[PDB]
Amino acid sequence: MLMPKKNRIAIYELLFKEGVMVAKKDVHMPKHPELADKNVPNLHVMKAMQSLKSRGYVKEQFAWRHFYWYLTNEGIQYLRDYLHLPPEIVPATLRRS
Amino acid sequence: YKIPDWFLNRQKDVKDGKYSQVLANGLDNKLREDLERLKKIRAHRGLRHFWGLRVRGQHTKTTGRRGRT
Amino acid sequence: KKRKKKSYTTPKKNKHKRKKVKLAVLKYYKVDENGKISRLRRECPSDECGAGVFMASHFDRHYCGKCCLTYCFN
Amino acid sequence: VQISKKRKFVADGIFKAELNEFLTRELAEDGYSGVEVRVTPTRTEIIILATRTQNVLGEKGRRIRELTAVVQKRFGFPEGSVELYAEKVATRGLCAIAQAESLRYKLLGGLAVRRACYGVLRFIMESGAKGCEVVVSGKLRGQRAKSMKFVDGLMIHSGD
Amino acid sequence: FRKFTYRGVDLDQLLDMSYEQLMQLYSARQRRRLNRGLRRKQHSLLKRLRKAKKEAPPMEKPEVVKTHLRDMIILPEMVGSMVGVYNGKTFNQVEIKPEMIGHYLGEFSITYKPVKHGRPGIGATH
Amino acid sequence: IHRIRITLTSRNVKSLEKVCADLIRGAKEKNLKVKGPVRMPTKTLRITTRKTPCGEGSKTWDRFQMRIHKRLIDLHSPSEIVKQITSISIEPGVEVEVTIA
Amino acid sequence: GHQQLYWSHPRKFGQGSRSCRVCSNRHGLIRKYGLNMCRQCFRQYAKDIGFIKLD
RNA sequence: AGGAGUGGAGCCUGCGGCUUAAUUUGACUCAACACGGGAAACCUCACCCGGCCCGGACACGGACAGGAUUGACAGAUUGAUA
RNA sequence: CAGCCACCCGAGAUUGAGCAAUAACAGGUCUGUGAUGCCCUUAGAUGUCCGGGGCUGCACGCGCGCUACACUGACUGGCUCAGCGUGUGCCUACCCUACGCCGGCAGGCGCGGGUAACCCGUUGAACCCCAUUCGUGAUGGGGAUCGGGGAUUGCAAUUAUUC
């Protein structure tokens, strides 16, 4: 779990900016798929989401070497309060109607 | 007739770099006895040659009943 | 199978132990005819490092972490 | 970007399998029945069939958009080119997946397994199907496992 | 006696010639390894074997040199070292000899105990 | 230019042939010089595999087979008519493309 | 020294990086057509993929 | 009726006895023994050693805001470039 | 009668497979499962990390094939001809093969022919119609066992696994 703070901060940032997210299962990989050119190895990514799910705020969902994230209202409030996010950002799909 | 060295069997000889041909009895078998040089180096090939086994990786698990009666 | 029993040597090895000063005083010091913080540590000339980087001036060599330059005194 | 037709065909089949697996793992609680794909020039829509449309929609229509973004983010397709509809089945009686899930969720909730099997058989036969069989196998009474059958109507098992 | 020489050319005479012309007397596979190009995995081990040679007491065998991967020969700089090569649990002691040129050092390492010749078992007669 | 080709690749013969007949009839309705349905050789991919998950029993090999079919139709027409005739509610499960010479 | 600590062997011949994509497994893999699935899941999905026995 | 011709006679993944650290096993008639789609250095590797992060989130106690890993060449050395 | 056996005709007068029922086996698969229950777990581990470490180890027999026994053919070449199909990549680097030259061999460099029946390729593959030996053999076939020379993906090919 020993990873830079900016990594987890950006993980939360992209999770909030997209509302939902996914986790790929591989260690032969160099970094994360959507986090390429960001030197964000997927190992620390799966560490991050397994910590988040073990914390009891995201329901686990898995299919075909991939993990699917969920979004709960309690989780939304917790993420906004902890990250000090402005109380006007909404999940991505609610934008553009 | 300027026949190249690779066509011969004694190309890249041991001891001295030799590429000519000499066909004669009593010395050809000593050249055949080239395992003794490697026997003195106790290599894995040397040990395998000591036991009289096929050093090229041939499976000798239980097969090879010929030559032992 | 049995237990692998990786216990032939080293009855219990632990993590590395690192002890640090509560507030480092070996980095800056007095006694240089200066009222400001006086420079005893070598300043790194490389751009990628700086004055906050303290190459540990041990009994030998300079230990940086990114470039690791070495100076001989003899 | 493009590949030969055989590889694209098998990749589209793989994508369909992935989609169906994720959906049956997700929305089987909402009476999920099936999925289908339509492809238009530079566009792809995926339609679903499930008994409880209001339950499968959710609140504010959030689940459809959330899942759509999930699949869009999963499969790396150009964004905005995927949309997921909301359709109900023609009937829950002649669909094997729907009745299998009904039996599943009658079994999980706590009920005599043979009562549930009898009920599903009656429901099938009032639906008008020409016949069916359901096999429930496992540990019902004791530690031994006996595969247990129910048949009604007539069923064919051979040929095309 | 009659002094052994590697294809008519000896250790000092191997030193005299450049490696590229030395390849002709050499064998392949330990000829392709140089021909394609050389890389790491021969830096720290060579460094420590040179140091074991240097810090050796006079007229005595140098300090043990520890290896896992069985090396090869491309220049005799390593010759004159005693090496423990890992076999899986222990280290095999090999002292490099000036008759080993043009051959792998993996042929002088073992991984298994030599087999035993005993008596037939119960279920082996059919 | 008057060099336009259309490519219909699919797996089923019935849907592909119905689409081809519909397209050829529509392109015949407007006074078009249209080349008929050119049938590229169908390619079948053969996969003989193990049936049992764990090797046990008899060597029964499942000969899974997928046959795919391709039709090419050339026609000399304005391209706007090509676009207007493409969107004729084509069959699901058929991949249709437009190729220029 | 993290680069030397992990993956000191570039694998342009490996098969686990593209193993079975249904479950993390390699045994009984097919590498044809980019399917990258085990025999079990290949036969459990061939109808969904578009393969069907006819002979 | 016999026909390729079987085991026959060297060299096969393969099985069976096989010390050793483990030659690993699962699967004994057809219905095991070119089977595990098994031609293996590496993913087929399960098994024998030394390190790699604990993949430990609730209760409760520590320097309790400076707690502690990547810091190429020499030194502590079953890696000196972990 | 249901049918069977011959003939005219006809392309075909029995083409070959796929699927394949009751009911079961304490058959195999907990080493596919992110399908798994209950004991063993909870770091002196029961993993990707060096791959370092091995079924390429041997005193006999059972168990799936090829070479072989030749004047039924090894043998110089004169040759005229296939079918099924994978094939230059939204993390998929690995692709089949022609111009000029070199070298016995592994290959080389310029664009390279490949979104296909356009490229491989009128797939110039096996035997034979002939051309020296053998003219009735342990040899030239059986090269199955030991020498030495090269390249292309290989961090490493030692126990030369690869040509």
mmCIF file with all atom_site columns, C-alpha atoms (C1' of nucleotides) in Angstrom, chain D residues 1-4 6-7 21 25 75-77 139 144 149 157-160, chain I residues 18-23 25-26 34-35 85-90 115-116:
data_model
loop_
_atom_site.group_PDB
_atom_site.id
_atom_site.type_symbol
_atom_site.label_atom_id
_atom_site.label_alt_id
_atom_site.label_comp_id
_atom_site.label_asym_id
_atom_site.label_entity_id
_atom_site.label_seq_id
_atom_site.pdbx_PDB_ins_code
_atom_site.Cartn_x
_atom_site.Cartn_y
_atom_site.Cartn_z
_atom_site.occupancy
_atom_site.B_iso_or_equiv
_atom_site.pdbx_formal_charge
_atom_site.auth_seq_id
_atom_site.auth_comp_id
_atom_site.auth_asym_id
_atom_site.auth_atom_id
_atom_site.pdbx_PDB_model_num
ATOM 1  C CA    . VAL D 1 1   ? -8.023  -0.108  -35.757 1.00 0.00 ? 1   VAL D CA    1
ATOM 2  C CA    . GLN D 1 2   ? -9.447  -2.710  -38.117 1.00 0.00 ? 2   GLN D CA    1
ATOM 3  C CA    . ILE D 1 3   ? -8.732  -6.445  -38.218 1.00 0.00 ? 3   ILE D CA    1
ATOM 4  C CA    . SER D 1 4   ? -9.845  -9.312  -40.441 1.00 0.00 ? 4   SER D CA    1
ATOM 5  C CA    . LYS D 1 6   ? -12.972 -13.783 -38.563 1.00 0.00 ? 6   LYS D CA    1
ATOM 6  C CA    . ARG D 1 7   ? -11.152 -12.098 -35.679 1.00 0.00 ? 7   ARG D CA    1
ATOM 7  C CA    . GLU D 1 21  ? -22.068 -12.640 -17.932 1.00 0.00 ? 21  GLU D CA    1
ATOM 8  C CA    . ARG D 1 25  ? -24.269 -11.569 -12.356 1.00 0.00 ? 25  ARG D CA    1
ATOM 9  C CA    . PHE D 1 75  ? -14.604 -2.181  -23.465 1.00 0.00 ? 75  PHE D CA    1
ATOM 10 C CA    . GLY D 1 76  ? -12.744 0.976   -24.516 1.00 0.00 ? 76  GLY D CA    1
ATOM 11 C CA    . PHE D 1 77  ? -15.185 1.880   -27.286 1.00 0.00 ? 77  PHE D CA    1
ATOM 12 C CA    . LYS D 1 139 ? -27.949 -32.140 -0.706  1.00 0.00 ? 139 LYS D CA    1
ATOM 13 C CA    . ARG D 1 144 ? -25.735 -37.799 0.263   1.00 0.00 ? 144 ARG D CA    1
ATOM 14 C CA    . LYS D 1 149 ? -36.239 -34.736 -11.584 1.00 0.00 ? 149 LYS D CA    1
ATOM 15 C CA    . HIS D 1 157 ? -33.627 -34.612 -26.803 1.00 0.00 ? 157 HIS D CA    1
ATOM 16 C CA    . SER D 1 158 ? -32.238 -35.468 -30.231 1.00 0.00 ? 158 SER D CA    1
ATOM 17 C CA    . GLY D 1 159 ? -31.854 -34.215 -33.776 1.00 0.00 ? 159 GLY D CA    1
ATOM 18 C CA    . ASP D 1 160 ? -31.739 -30.665 -35.105 1.00 0.00 ? 160 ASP D CA    1
ATOM 19 C "C1'" . G   I 2 18  ? -23.368 -33.980 -35.736 1.00 0.00 ? 18  G   I "C1'" 1
ATOM 20 C "C1'" . C   I 2 19  ? -27.233 -34.505 -32.109 1.00 0.00 ? 19  C   I "C1'" 1
ATOM 21 C "C1'" . A   I 2 20  ? -28.671 -38.646 -29.520 1.00 0.00 ? 20  A   I "C1'" 1
ATOM 22 C "C1'" . A   I 2 21  ? -33.730 -41.769 -24.598 1.00 0.00 ? 21  A   I "C1'" 1
ATOM 23 C "C1'" . U   I 2 22  ? -35.432 -44.461 -19.029 1.00 0.00 ? 22  U   I "C1'" 1
ATOM 24 C "C1'" . A   I 2 23  ? -32.553 -44.929 -14.962 1.00 0.00 ? 23  A   I "C1'" 1
ATOM 25 C "C1'" . C   I 2 25  ? -21.817 -45.188 -11.700 1.00 0.00 ? 25  C   I "C1'" 1
ATOM 26 C "C1'" . A   I 2 26  ? -20.436 -43.776 -3.981  1.00 0.00 ? 26  A   I "C1'" 1
ATOM 27 C "C1'" . G   I 2 34  ? -13.680 -14.823 -9.415  1.00 0.00 ? 34  G   I "C1'" 1
ATOM 28 C "C1'" . A   I 2 35  ? -19.426 -22.273 -8.605  1.00 0.00 ? 35  A   I "C1'" 1
ATOM 29 C "C1'" . G   I 2 85  ? -6.686  -23.340 -43.673 1.00 0.00 ? 85  G   I "C1'" 1
ATOM 30 C "C1'" . U   I 2 86  ? -4.269  -19.492 -40.084 1.00 0.00 ? 86  U   I "C1'" 1
ATOM 31 C "C1'" . G   I 2 87  ? -1.635  -15.211 -42.093 1.00 0.00 ? 87  G   I "C1'" 1
ATOM 32 C "C1'" . U   I 2 88  ? 1.806   -7.220  -40.880 1.00 0.00 ? 88  U   I "C1'" 1
ATOM 33 C "C1'" . G   I 2 89  ? -2.672  -6.313  -34.417 1.00 0.00 ? 89  G   I "C1'" 1
ATOM 34 C "C1'" . C   I 2 90  ? -8.138  0.122   -28.959 1.00 0.00 ? 90  C   I "C1'" 1
ATOM 35 C "C1'" . U   I 2 115 ? -7.902  -6.592  -45.553 1.00 0.00 ? 115 U   I "C1'" 1
ATOM 36 C "C1'" . A   I 2 116 ? -7.800  -11.075 -49.379 1.00 0.00 ? 116 A   I "C1'" 1
#
